[PDB]
RNA sequence: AAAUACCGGCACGAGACCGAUAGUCAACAAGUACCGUAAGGGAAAGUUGAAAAGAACUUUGAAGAGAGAGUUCAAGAGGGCG
RNA sequence: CGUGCGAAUCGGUCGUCCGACCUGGGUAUAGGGGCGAAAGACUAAUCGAACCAUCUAGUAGCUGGUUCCCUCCAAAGUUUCC
RNA sequence: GCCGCCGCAGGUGCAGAUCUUGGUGGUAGUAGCAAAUAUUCAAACGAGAACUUUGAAGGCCGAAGUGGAGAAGGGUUCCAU
RNA sequence: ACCUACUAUCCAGCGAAACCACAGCCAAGGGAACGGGCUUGGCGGAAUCAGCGGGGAAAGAAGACCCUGUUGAGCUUGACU
RNA sequence: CCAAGCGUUGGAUUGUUCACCCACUAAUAGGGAACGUGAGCUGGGUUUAGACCGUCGUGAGACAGGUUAGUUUUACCCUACU
């Protein structure tokens, strides 16, 4: 016998094994597909999420009844120093897959890149890549490696890359800087490796990956949240208050016979902390960092062409639970994954995208600074003073 | 009396025993097997680790929702706990047995613990109250342990 | 080093509550082989076993 | 008066019986420990050895628990001990 | 709470509270019998007939059980009268 | 202290009866030691101090009392070594 | 939705119960006609900590309903004595 | 016809399974799963013991005739699922 009047129901049934992800960077499960009439470039990128703000801009779509009106906009700010390559790698394409085929490394390889191997950096003598660069300055290690540069010339179809972060520059504790391989997109792999090798030991930024106004795809860990109840984790109906042992419950777990308990049906258990691909984030600005020159700083990165005044992203009092933000930027519409200070890898999109909403050039108006710690008011120090007099202080 | 072996040779080699004893069976054998492949001044030394919660003993047998913890990995396990009353009982047995090594003449610094059983003894009665008027029991697990040590360089 | 007893005999000479006796400490054993009431009566005299004074209630 | 009757009493003698969950409720401080206001209900519980010869002296320990000495044909009989 | 603290408790909210009020001691009523502002209520954790001993091992066309091996032969549920 | 052969005699052979009595497991070092607000720092006795003893702090009962004394009932539980 | 009190949770010390042929992954097939063990297929990788309440036709009490028994009792009158 | 991909709702009177009316709507199709589901809840109905009528009997008593008040026990073992 069957269901009175029906509903939908609870929860997603394709994200379910809800489980603690195994690893703590998000992994980029998919590249996009090359064609060899484009030219190289990288794809992905590391940023930390770093804050949220308001905007203010004035929109063109034309039909809507916000057509050169001026809406608010909400932003996330992601800190991006720019990455260091060290290397390269070779795959194959096979029957039973991509088997990766050769690994090869800089001559010059970071600290923060040597504490990446390990567990224990206070005891150890520091010993990865002692006897390995060797090779690179050695008359009988220019053509083995250069025997091997010219058998993924034959041999390998795809090609990838290979960058660790900047955690000397970063506000953080952590002094542990990320290895991530990343895919080249682009000419015969004969061109693909000219580039390569020739950028090892190198700087990218950010303005060589990414544009202003692209519709990028963000990847990573979630908040966490802890072993929590049936009511929070699967969103079902309370119990009525009257329930003997409890009213935030499924009261019915199965039918009688096919006498198991399906994995359909929804349980306690761990809450968040799982990896994630949202899509479809804009980019409004990509910001530029603390350049000094001629004596003087310059850090106008908020500075919109609607007011220019002598102010950074950065808010009064700084951003919360992280720090300040002196290394450029990237301004993300709408919200993204983690918590702050967590690591947030990017993308391009699969999807080639021509919809009006894609196509849409951004110019701002406002950007916020006002303390993010309480309830603000003030824009910037300087303007205080000016609406407040002296102190008993001064 | 005798011990569940004897001596290899008996001239190298001293004895020690304990005759009901107020301590849980289990806690004592599962400690008795950590100590076993060990020096006296390992074993000595381990004994106030544990007491002093910096080496846990691993619960191996009698594992019954014993927790977890993170100085069993050193052990390879994962369940373990750190028994107090347990060590101090079977570190006062060895100042038994480190006592007679000398009583024959012979070198204390390597006395390798061979043999260390451990065994169940005579139960003790009382009782409990339980609901509806009723009366359960309440009883005691006490132990006879036994060691063994043996001269090795 | 005990002195549940001497306690008791002072609260039954000082006619008060064993709350308001004050057994000298530093001289815990000259008090505690007293143990027999002439031999507090003393105490008292010298100095070591005192009454305590009224706790205020301002009427004020 | 006798020839008859006698699972209570006082002494006695036997047994093709039972052998300590048996045989009387009771081989032992049993109609005793203990339960019920009271009438009443009512157990469990035998065995060192030939002889106490029941382990001086030493040694670890605060103490029980131990290591060596020793009595015995034996402690592989150590005071609830074939 | 429901292997409890309790073989009927505890908590918040509740009914009565100068009158057929609410309680201590001494006393009368005893089992087809007592007492009942009357529910078959109460009569020592027992009540549409209390508890203790005996008659008693009460009777059962109905349940449950029914102890060593090999050798040989091997049925019946149909017929009258209850 | 005991057994074979010919004959006698019977309280003579167990897997079970929600059978009688005694002993022992798995569950299990698990259920659990959650009602009426609350403790902390120093010393001195000692082989051993979160709990006992003294001194100082902060607290509760709040005279319809966690105060002071009796009757039933208990029968020495009273007091020091 | 969020907060507070006490548990639950983890550790030292103390430490009981109900229950238990043997045990414990599914399909369908037959079978005392709704199998954990049989038959045909799917399959099967030490030891375990917190939860849950589908399944063990779960535990708990020789069905209180119905029928039989040449088994009874409490009540009532024109049953018989 | 292929098609069971995705849905098929809010309220009044009634204990309802059923019924009938208001309103919104792409539409308010039908069923199984021990007539899916009480160691998941609720006990409002039936189906114990108190009480009142309305028919039957001289009566103890009786009603698919109606009423008022009536205590929902366990998980710590195996599996299953998380």
Not at chain 2, 15 to 41: D, P, Y
């Amino acid at each position: 016998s069957h269901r009175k009047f029906s509903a939908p129901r609870h929860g997603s049934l394709g994200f379910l094994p809800r489980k603690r992800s195994s690893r703590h960077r998000g992994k980029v499960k998919s590249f996009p597909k090359d064609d060899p009439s484009k030219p190289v470039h990288l794809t992905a990128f590391l940023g930390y999420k770093a804050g949220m703000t308001h905007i203010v801009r004035e929109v063109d779509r034309p039909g809507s009844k916000v057509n050169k009106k001026e809406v608010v906009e909400a932003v996330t700010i992601v800190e991006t120093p720019p990455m260091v390559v060290v290397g390269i790698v070779g795959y194959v394409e096979t029957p039973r897959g991509l088997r990766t085929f050769k690994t090869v490394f800089a001559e010059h390889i970071s600290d923060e890149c040597k504490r990446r191997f390990y567990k224990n950096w206070h005891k150890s003598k520091k010993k990865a890549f002692t006897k390995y660069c060797k090779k690179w300055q050695d008359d009988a290690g220019k053509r083995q490696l250069d025997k091997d540069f010219s058998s993924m010339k034959k041999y390998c179809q795809v090609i990838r890359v290979l960058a660790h972060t900047q955690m000397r520059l970063l506000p953080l504790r952590q002094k542990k800087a990320h290895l991530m391989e990343i895919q080249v997109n682009g000419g015969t792999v004969a061109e693909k490796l000219d580039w390569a090798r020739e950028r090892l030991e190198q700087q990218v930024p950010v303005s060589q990956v990414f544009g202003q106004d692209e519709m990028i795809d963000v990847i990573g860990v979630t908040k966490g949240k802890g072993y929590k109840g049936v009511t929070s984790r699967w969103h079902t109906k309370k119990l009525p208050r009257k329930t003997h042992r409890g009213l935030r419950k499924v009261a019915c777990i199965g039918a009688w016979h096919p006498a198991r308990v399906a994995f359909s049906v929804a349980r306690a258990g761990q809450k968040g902390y799982h990896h994630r691909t949202e899509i479809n984030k804009k980019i409004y600005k990509i910001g530029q960092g603390y350049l000094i020159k001629d004596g003087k700083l310059i850090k106008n990165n908020a500075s919109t062409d609607y007011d220019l005044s002598d102010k950074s992203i950065n808010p009064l009092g700084g951003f919360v639970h992280y720090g300040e933000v002196t290394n450029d930027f990237v301004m993300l519409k709408g919200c993204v994954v983690g918590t702050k200070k967590r690591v947030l890898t990017l993308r391009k999109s699969l999807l080639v995208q021509t919809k009006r909403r894609a196509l849409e050039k951004i110019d701002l108006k406002f950007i916020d600074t006002t303390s993010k710690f309480g309830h603000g008011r003030f824009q910037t120090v300087e303007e205080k003073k000016a609406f407040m007099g002296p102190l008993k202080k001064d | 009396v005798r011990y569940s072996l004897d001596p290899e040779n008996p001239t190298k080699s001293c004895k020690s025993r304990g005759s009901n004893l107020r301590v849980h069976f289990k806690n004592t054998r599962e400690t008795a097997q950590a100590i076993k492949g060990m020096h006296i001044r390992k074993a000595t030394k381990y004994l106030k680790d544990v007491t002093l919660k910096k080496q846990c003993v691993p619960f191996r047998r009698y594992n019954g929702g014993v927790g977890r913890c993170a100085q069993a990995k050193q052990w390879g396990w994962t369940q373990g706990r750190w028994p107090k009353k347990s060590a101090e009982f079977l570190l006062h047995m060895l100042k038994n047995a480190e006592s007679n090594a000398e009583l024959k003449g012979l070198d204390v610094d390597s006395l390798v613990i061979e043999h260390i059983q451990v065994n169940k003894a005579p139960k003790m009665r009382r009782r409990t109250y339980r609901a509806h008027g009723r009366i359960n029991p309440y009883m005691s697990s006490p132990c006879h342990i036994e060691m063994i040590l043996t001269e090795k360089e | 080093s005990m002195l549940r007893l001497q306690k008791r005999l002072a609260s039954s000479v000082l006619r008060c509550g064993k709350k308001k006796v004050w057994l000298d400490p530093n001289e815990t054993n000259e008090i505690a082989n007293a143990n027999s009431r002439q031999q507090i009566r003393k105490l008292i005299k010298d100095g070591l076993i005192i009454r305590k004074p009224v706790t205020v209630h301002s009427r004020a």
